């Protein structure tokens, strides 16, 4: 349905952390996306490492190597 | 593991007009003799909203690749502004260097760019149309974001 | 962790029903999707700062967003 994992608090704290001053109200729905994305890519990377390696309980260390395999940004050389 | 390692990329002739072709000096390493191709590309945001309007500035395909520290300086010509959306064209985007080996790409460098207007009329009363000739190209070079992929070798 | 447990936990069974009914999570698993999370939307949201301070708008927009997600190779 329109299940939401993230309030709009939450994302109004998100971005003050990142210095975001103010935020459009496109912005709620947009993060709102982008969030469903990248679970849905890390849930993914994350089922196989349980489903292929006979397991019904997804531990954290799939998530840690799903995360992993996500590709990692850094911001600088 | 990984047979590639960028070690630095500096943007040179920034900041600049619009059409002047982007200018970045790679220097990266390869810890063994490249059996495979290395292929670099320059790719251009043209619009935030979609992918379809990515121009691909240029593509280096080098092979093989001696192993050891080489640097070379990436030139590649401006975008075509026919294909930037009016909205977009203004404002804030993004240029990529993509670093692909086996056809597989291993890292993205990112630079947010800036295209401002220097005449203070059109920054108060910009041209209905983008005039690109009177566009400065203002890549921030400061803020890199250095994306790494995990490939087979 | 400022993204409260249960409704991202929510989320996440609706996504893994998306994909397998008969699926299950850990908490020690919730928790470290929620640091994941937190930390790239911060991450985003930085970048759109950057994009903000350039431009003559304040408010940051969508195209922040998806220019962020764009860099990142997302």
Not at chain 2, 53 to 66: A, K, M, T
Not at chain 2, 97 to 125: A, K, S
Not at chain 3, 32 to 53: H, M, R
Request: charged share 25%.
């Amino acid at each position: 349905d329109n299940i939401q994992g993230i309030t709009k608090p939450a994302i109004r704290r998100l971005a003050r952390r990142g210095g975001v001053k103010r935020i459009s109200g496109l912005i709620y729905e947009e993060t709102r996306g982008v969030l469903k994305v990248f679970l849905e890519n890390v849930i993914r990377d994350a089922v196989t490492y349980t489903e292929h390696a006979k397991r019904k309980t997804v531990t954290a260390m799939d998530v840690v190597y799903a995360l992993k395999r996500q590709g990692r940004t850094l911001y600088g050389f | 593991m990984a047979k590639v390692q960028v070690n630095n990329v500096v943007v040179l002739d920034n900041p600049s007009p619009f059409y002047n072709p982007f200018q970045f000096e790679i220097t990266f390493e390869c810890i063994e003799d490249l059996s495979e191709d290395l292929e670099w590309k320059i790719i251009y945001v043209g619009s935030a909203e979609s992918e379809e309007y990515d121009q691909v500035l240029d593509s280096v395909l080098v092979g093989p690749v001696p192993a050891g520290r080489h640097m070379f300086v990436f030139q590649a010509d401006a975008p075509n502004p026919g294909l930037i959306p009016d909205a977009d064209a203004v404002g804030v985007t993004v240029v990529l260097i993509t670093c692909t080996y086996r056809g597989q790409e291993f890292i993205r460098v990112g630079y947010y760019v800036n295209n401002e207007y220097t005449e203070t009329e059109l920054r108060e009363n910009p041209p209905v149309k983008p005039d690109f000739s009177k566009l400065q190209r203002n890549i921030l070079a400061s803020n890199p974001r250095v994306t790494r992929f995990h490939i087979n070798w | 962790l400022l993204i409260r447990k249960l409704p991202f936990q929510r989320l996440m069974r609706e996504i893994a029903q998306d994909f397998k009914t008969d699926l299950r999570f850990q908490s020690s698993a919730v928790m470290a999707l929620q640091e994941a999370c937190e930390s790239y939307l911060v991450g985003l949201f930085e970048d759109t700062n950057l994009c903000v301070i350039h431009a003559k708008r304040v408010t940051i927009m969508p195209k922040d967003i998806q220019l962020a997600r764009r860099i990142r190779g997302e």
